[PDB]
Amino acid sequence: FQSMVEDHYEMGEELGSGQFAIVRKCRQKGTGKEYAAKFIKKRRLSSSRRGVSREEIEREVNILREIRHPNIITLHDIFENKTDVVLILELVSGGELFDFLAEKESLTEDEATQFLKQILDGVHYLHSKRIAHFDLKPENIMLLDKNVPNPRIKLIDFGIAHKIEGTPEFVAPEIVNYEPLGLEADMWSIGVITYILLSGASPFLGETKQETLTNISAVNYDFDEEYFSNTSELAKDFIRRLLVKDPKRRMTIAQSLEHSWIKAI
Amino acid sequence: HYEMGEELGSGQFAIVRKCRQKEYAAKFIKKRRLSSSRRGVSREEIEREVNILREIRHPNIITLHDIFENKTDVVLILELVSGGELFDFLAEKSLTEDEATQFLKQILDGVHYLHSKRIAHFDLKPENIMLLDKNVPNPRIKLIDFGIAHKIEAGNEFKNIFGTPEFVAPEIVNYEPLGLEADMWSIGVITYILLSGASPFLGETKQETLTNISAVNYDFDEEYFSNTSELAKDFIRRLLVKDPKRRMTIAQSLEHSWIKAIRR
Ligand SMILES: CC(C)(C)c1nc2c3ccc(F)cc3c3c(=O)[nH]ccc3c2[nH]1
Ligand SMILES: CC(C)(C)c1nc2c3ccc(F)cc3c3c(=O)[nH]ccc3c2[nH]1
Ligand SMILES: [Cl-]
Ligand SMILES: [Cl-]
């Protein structure tokens, strides 16, 4: 008896997918307006059906419903049936940012900083609401429309996003020493994104996955002159202030926006 | 629909009153008014506690029988315990090691049940270990206060394991969630105090206590442990281990020769 999404939206081409998600272009039957419909497969232990837990779906949905910013996708409706939760989301048609940048001729640092600034604005909005994205990477940085003079960044995939934040005689050492994961992880990811934006190279990427993980944990990277010889010193400083091991030492999003490199843009 | 009575206890954002429908305990939890506010308990934290209580059914753990809500408070109707805190009952009583293990076994049974459901209590201490009724020949332990209890995290909660790790922060790469082992440390401390009346890591200030815990700075002063067996000391030593992965688990604790022994 729940409202069926197909009674309100006609479904079209598949646009993307994940382990437990399929995204289709759809058209609102009432208006003709186009959206993206994200079908999230529900876990059903009873039927041995693998999928996303109720709690995880609720987490993502509750975050999406709070978000209203021009650089983040917007949520328009929610449907649920036996097997799926279906989210009607803002349609982004310009593809991945880094695919668009690859197609450009003579991409300059100043032009690159313009897109980075949009990413900072979206993240500043998120962090102002205590939302960490936790999966900031090029594949989650889309463009609304790539056939415009100044294409607009749209962040997607809030699948692992989280809202952040007596006697001690009986607490364990790991509790004493506990430091929760927070907004700082996004700021590290921004550092990595900035490095690849300015160079075309991934800073921690190893020949094998174990090497990559080792590099990240040691914070082992370089500004190779092949790629960085004519990158501004302000850009390198921006990156260096984000790619530090201690989360509490990293620039926060407000600091990032007040950095001389960004203030110049 | 419930006639309230006297105030039984309180915490930072909770007050418990005796009530009658059949007598019960009425836990009043104050809701945060604004998500940004530091005053009161968030909706998510209340639901978390309720969901834990709803799925637990075990003789050594309090049960949930009803829920009520308004703009300011969430009220849980819980099983009433009238035997007080365990340690008070033992204080008014000397106590043999064998008698001490009879009560500890019930604590271990309740924790075993929780851990079987991947729930860590996270606030095991004497004040949360009650007796259902202290005027019977074999009093039953009842664990209370699931205010910070959690189902233990998946491990891919903060990480997309289906994608590249290239943009992931080192604290996520090296993330170690809190787990069931924290309760097992707490059990070691409870056991130490049960046998000696002394707190192993207690310092002059809260920060000193925390520093002692972090260094695992304790001993078995003969002043307090002259009459304690080597097996009891061994049980405690196997729980008060810094590395959570080298600490006794609940099943190992139950198999330990100090507990496994048959008693009257
Ligand atoms: C698979 C994942 C859930 C990350 C996702 N992929 C897309 C996507 C892929 C291609 C495309 F043209 C559009 C989208 C898209 C979209 O347009 N809106 C919201 C999410 C979303 C999306 N969300
Ligand atoms: C403060 C805290 C929430 C931990 C709590 N205190 C009590 C409590 C205190 C004295 C007493 F006689 C009974 C209780 C009691 C109880 O009887 N049932 C459930 C919880 C609970 C409780 N829960
Ligand atoms: Cl998405
Ligand atoms: Cl309680």
mmCIF file of all heavy atoms in Angstrom, chain B residues 178-202:
data_model
loop_
_atom_site.group_PDB
_atom_site.id
_atom_site.type_symbol
_atom_site.label_atom_id
_atom_site.label_comp_id
_atom_site.label_asym_id
_atom_site.label_seq_id
_atom_site.Cartn_x
_atom_site.Cartn_y
_atom_site.Cartn_z
ATOM 1 N N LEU B 178 36.296 0.960 19.066
ATOM 2 C CA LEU B 178 36.117 0.414 20.396
ATOM 3 C C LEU B 178 35.283 -0.856 20.264
ATOM 4 O O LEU B 178 34.405 -0.945 19.415
ATOM 5 C CB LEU B 178 35.403 1.420 21.297
ATOM 6 C CG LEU B 178 36.156 2.726 21.561
ATOM 7 C CD1 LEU B 178 35.283 3.651 22.374
ATOM 8 C CD2 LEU B 178 37.489 2.483 22.246
ATOM 9 N N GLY B 179 35.571 -1.851 21.085
ATOM 10 C CA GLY B 179 34.874 -3.118 20.966
ATOM 11 C C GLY B 179 34.539 -3.775 22.276
ATOM 12 O O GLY B 179 34.604 -3.155 23.345
ATOM 13 N N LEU B 180 34.209 -5.061 22.175
ATOM 14 C CA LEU B 180 33.777 -5.864 23.321
ATOM 15 C C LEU B 180 34.868 -5.963 24.397
ATOM 16 O O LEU B 180 34.578 -6.129 25.582
ATOM 17 C CB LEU B 180 33.368 -7.267 22.833
ATOM 18 C CG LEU B 180 32.295 -7.333 21.737
ATOM 19 C CD1 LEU B 180 32.024 -8.771 21.361
ATOM 20 C CD2 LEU B 180 30.984 -6.614 22.150
ATOM 21 N N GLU B 181 36.123 -5.868 23.973
ATOM 22 C CA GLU B 181 37.268 -5.984 24.884
ATOM 23 C C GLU B 181 37.250 -4.931 25.997
ATOM 24 O O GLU B 181 37.731 -5.189 27.099
ATOM 25 C CB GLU B 181 38.598 -5.893 24.122
ATOM 26 C CG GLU B 181 38.697 -6.808 22.916
ATOM 27 C CD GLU B 181 38.374 -6.115 21.592
ATOM 28 O OE1 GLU B 181 37.647 -5.089 21.578
ATOM 29 O OE2 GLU B 181 38.859 -6.608 20.557
ATOM 30 N N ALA B 182 36.703 -3.749 25.716
ATOM 31 C CA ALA B 182 36.620 -2.705 26.740
ATOM 32 C C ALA B 182 35.836 -3.180 27.984
ATOM 33 O O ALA B 182 36.239 -2.898 29.099
ATOM 34 C CB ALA B 182 36.004 -1.429 26.153
ATOM 35 N N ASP B 183 34.752 -3.930 27.773
ATOM 36 C CA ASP B 183 33.949 -4.506 28.856
ATOM 37 C C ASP B 183 34.754 -5.508 29.673
ATOM 38 O O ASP B 183 34.577 -5.596 30.878
ATOM 39 C CB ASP B 183 32.715 -5.236 28.313
ATOM 40 C CG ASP B 183 31.596 -4.304 27.889
ATOM 41 O OD1 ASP B 183 31.565 -3.112 28.279
ATOM 42 O OD2 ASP B 183 30.712 -4.809 27.179
ATOM 43 N N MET B 184 35.625 -6.262 29.005
ATOM 44 C CA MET B 184 36.435 -7.285 29.666
ATOM 45 C C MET B 184 37.488 -6.649 30.587
ATOM 46 O O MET B 184 37.768 -7.161 31.669
ATOM 47 C CB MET B 184 37.098 -8.204 28.625
ATOM 48 C CG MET B 184 36.124 -9.056 27.792
ATOM 49 S SD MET B 184 34.757 -9.777 28.720
ATOM 50 C CE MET B 184 35.617 -10.773 29.939
ATOM 51 N N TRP B 185 38.039 -5.514 30.167
ATOM 52 C CA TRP B 185 38.894 -4.707 31.047
ATOM 53 C C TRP B 185 38.087 -4.263 32.275
ATOM 54 O O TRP B 185 38.521 -4.438 33.424
ATOM 55 C CB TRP B 185 39.445 -3.494 30.303
ATOM 56 C CG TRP B 185 40.172 -2.511 31.196
ATOM 57 C CD1 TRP B 185 39.600 -1.603 32.052
ATOM 58 C CD2 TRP B 185 41.584 -2.365 31.343
ATOM 59 N NE1 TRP B 185 40.570 -0.906 32.706
ATOM 60 C CE2 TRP B 185 41.799 -1.343 32.294
ATOM 61 C CE3 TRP B 185 42.693 -2.986 30.759
ATOM 62 C CZ2 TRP B 185 43.078 -0.922 32.668
ATOM 63 C CZ3 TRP B 185 43.972 -2.573 31.152
ATOM 64 C CH2 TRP B 185 44.144 -1.549 32.094
ATOM 65 N N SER B 186 36.903 -3.706 32.035
ATOM 66 C CA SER B 186 36.033 -3.268 33.131
ATOM 67 C C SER B 186 35.739 -4.384 34.119
ATOM 68 O O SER B 186 35.738 -4.139 35.308
ATOM 69 C CB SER B 186 34.729 -2.695 32.612
ATOM 70 O OG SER B 186 34.998 -1.584 31.764
ATOM 71 N N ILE B 187 35.498 -5.592 33.619
ATOM 72 C CA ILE B 187 35.301 -6.770 34.468
ATOM 73 C C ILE B 187 36.521 -7.078 35.333
ATOM 74 O O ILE B 187 36.379 -7.442 36.518
ATOM 75 C CB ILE B 187 34.848 -8.006 33.617
ATOM 76 C CG1 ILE B 187 33.396 -7.788 33.164
ATOM 77 C CG2 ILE B 187 34.966 -9.315 34.415
ATOM 78 C CD1 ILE B 187 32.931 -8.679 32.015
ATOM 79 N N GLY B 188 37.720 -6.926 34.771
ATOM 80 C CA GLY B 188 38.942 -7.082 35.568
ATOM 81 C C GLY B 188 38.998 -6.096 36.721
ATOM 82 O O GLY B 188 39.342 -6.462 37.843
ATOM 83 N N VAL B 189 38.627 -4.843 36.465
ATOM 84 C CA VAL B 189 38.625 -3.822 37.522
ATOM 85 C C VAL B 189 37.561 -4.131 38.577
ATOM 86 O O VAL B 189 37.829 -4.010 39.775
ATOM 87 C CB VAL B 189 38.398 -2.388 36.983
ATOM 88 C CG1 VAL B 189 38.482 -1.373 38.123
ATOM 89 C CG2 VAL B 189 39.422 -2.043 35.906
ATOM 90 N N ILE B 190 36.360 -4.507 38.134
ATOM 91 C CA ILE B 190 35.274 -4.867 39.055
ATOM 92 C C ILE B 190 35.703 -6.036 39.939
ATOM 93 O O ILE B 190 35.430 -6.048 41.149
ATOM 94 C CB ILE B 190 33.973 -5.231 38.280
ATOM 95 C CG1 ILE B 190 33.366 -3.987 37.614
ATOM 96 C CG2 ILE B 190 32.932 -5.905 39.195
ATOM 97 C CD1 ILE B 190 32.236 -4.308 36.632
ATOM 98 N N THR B 191 36.401 -7.000 39.339
ATOM 99 C CA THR B 191 36.867 -8.185 40.063
ATOM 100 C C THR B 191 37.922 -7.837 41.117
ATOM 101 O O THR B 191 37.888 -8.342 42.242
ATOM 102 C CB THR B 191 37.435 -9.232 39.106
ATOM 103 O OG1 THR B 191 36.432 -9.585 38.140
ATOM 104 C CG2 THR B 191 37.869 -10.494 39.879
ATOM 105 N N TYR B 192 38.847 -6.967 40.746
ATOM 106 C CA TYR B 192 39.866 -6.479 41.666
ATOM 107 C C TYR B 192 39.213 -5.839 42.903
ATOM 108 O O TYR B 192 39.562 -6.178 44.042
ATOM 109 C CB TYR B 192 40.757 -5.486 40.918
ATOM 110 C CG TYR B 192 41.961 -4.945 41.666
ATOM 111 C CD1 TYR B 192 43.248 -5.346 41.321
ATOM 112 C CD2 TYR B 192 41.818 -3.997 42.668
ATOM 113 C CE1 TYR B 192 44.357 -4.843 41.974
ATOM 114 C CE2 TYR B 192 42.930 -3.472 43.332
ATOM 115 C CZ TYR B 192 44.192 -3.899 42.976
ATOM 116 O OH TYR B 192 45.295 -3.402 43.620
ATOM 117 N N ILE B 193 38.254 -4.938 42.684
ATOM 118 C CA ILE B 193 37.604 -4.232 43.795
ATOM 119 C C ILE B 193 36.723 -5.169 44.620
ATOM 120 O O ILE B 193 36.666 -5.054 45.845
ATOM 121 C CB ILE B 193 36.727 -3.028 43.355
ATOM 122 C CG1 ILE B 193 37.441 -2.110 42.374
ATOM 123 C CG2 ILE B 193 36.355 -2.169 44.570
ATOM 124 C CD1 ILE B 193 36.638 -0.850 42.051
ATOM 125 N N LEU B 194 36.022 -6.074 43.945
ATOM 126 C CA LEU B 194 35.210 -7.095 44.614
ATOM 127 C C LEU B 194 36.022 -7.891 45.642
ATOM 128 O O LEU B 194 35.543 -8.146 46.749
ATOM 129 C CB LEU B 194 34.606 -8.045 43.575
ATOM 130 C CG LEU B 194 33.823 -9.279 44.036
ATOM 131 C CD1 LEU B 194 32.524 -8.894 44.731
ATOM 132 C CD2 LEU B 194 33.550 -10.187 42.838
ATOM 133 N N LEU B 195 37.245 -8.276 45.274
ATOM 134 C CA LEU B 195 38.089 -9.107 46.142
ATOM 135 C C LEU B 195 38.857 -8.308 47.196
ATOM 136 O O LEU B 195 39.157 -8.835 48.251
ATOM 137 C CB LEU B 195 39.079 -9.948 45.319
ATOM 138 C CG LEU B 195 38.487 -10.952 44.325
ATOM 139 C CD1 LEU B 195 39.597 -11.632 43.532
ATOM 140 C CD2 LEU B 195 37.610 -11.988 45.007
ATOM 141 N N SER B 196 39.175 -7.046 46.920
ATOM 142 C CA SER B 196 40.071 -6.274 47.788
ATOM 143 C C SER B 196 39.435 -5.069 48.476
ATOM 144 O O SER B 196 39.958 -4.598 49.494
ATOM 145 C CB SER B 196 41.276 -5.783 46.980
ATOM 146 O OG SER B 196 40.880 -4.882 45.961
ATOM 147 N N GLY B 197 38.347 -4.552 47.911
ATOM 148 C CA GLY B 197 37.780 -3.279 48.347
ATOM 149 C C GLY B 197 38.561 -2.051 47.882
ATOM 150 O O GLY B 197 38.191 -0.924 48.212
ATOM 151 N N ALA B 198 39.631 -2.265 47.116
ATOM 152 C CA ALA B 198 40.483 -1.192 46.627
ATOM 153 C C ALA B 198 40.328 -1.070 45.114
ATOM 154 O O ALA B 198 40.074 -2.054 44.438
ATOM 155 C CB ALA B 198 41.938 -1.467 46.986
ATOM 156 N N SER B 199 40.485 0.146 44.603
ATOM 157 C CA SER B 199 40.399 0.425 43.169
ATOM 158 C C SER B 199 41.804 0.438 42.573
ATOM 159 O O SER B 199 42.650 1.199 43.030
ATOM 160 C CB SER B 199 39.718 1.771 42.944
ATOM 161 O OG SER B 199 39.464 1.997 41.568
ATOM 162 N N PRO B 200 42.060 -0.404 41.553
ATOM 163 C CA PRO B 200 43.443 -0.607 41.096
ATOM 164 C C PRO B 200 44.148 0.622 40.496
ATOM 165 O O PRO B 200 45.346 0.796 40.712
ATOM 166 C CB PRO B 200 43.317 -1.741 40.064
ATOM 167 C CG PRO B 200 41.895 -1.763 39.655
ATOM 168 C CD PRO B 200 41.090 -1.204 40.783
ATOM 169 N N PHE B 201 43.420 1.450 39.752
ATOM 170 C CA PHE B 201 44.009 2.597 39.052
ATOM 171 C C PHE B 201 43.642 3.957 39.639
ATOM 172 O O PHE B 201 44.115 4.973 39.147
ATOM 173 C CB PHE B 201 43.602 2.570 37.571
ATOM 174 C CG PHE B 201 43.945 1.286 36.901
ATOM 175 C CD1 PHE B 201 42.959 0.356 36.590
ATOM 176 C CD2 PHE B 201 45.263 0.986 36.620
ATOM 177 C CE1 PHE B 201 43.301 -0.853 35.985
ATOM 178 C CE2 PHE B 201 45.609 -0.217 36.034
ATOM 179 C CZ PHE B 201 44.635 -1.134 35.714
ATOM 180 N N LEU B 202 42.815 3.979 40.684
ATOM 181 C CA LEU B 202 42.357 5.238 41.277
ATOM 182 C C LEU B 202 43.533 6.103 41.715
ATOM 183 O O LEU B 202 44.400 5.657 42.464
ATOM 184 C CB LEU B 202 41.424 4.979 42.465
ATOM 185 C CG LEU B 202 40.921 6.192 43.258
ATOM 186 C CD1 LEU B 202 40.121 7.107 42.347
ATOM 187 C CD2 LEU B 202 40.087 5.766 44.469
#
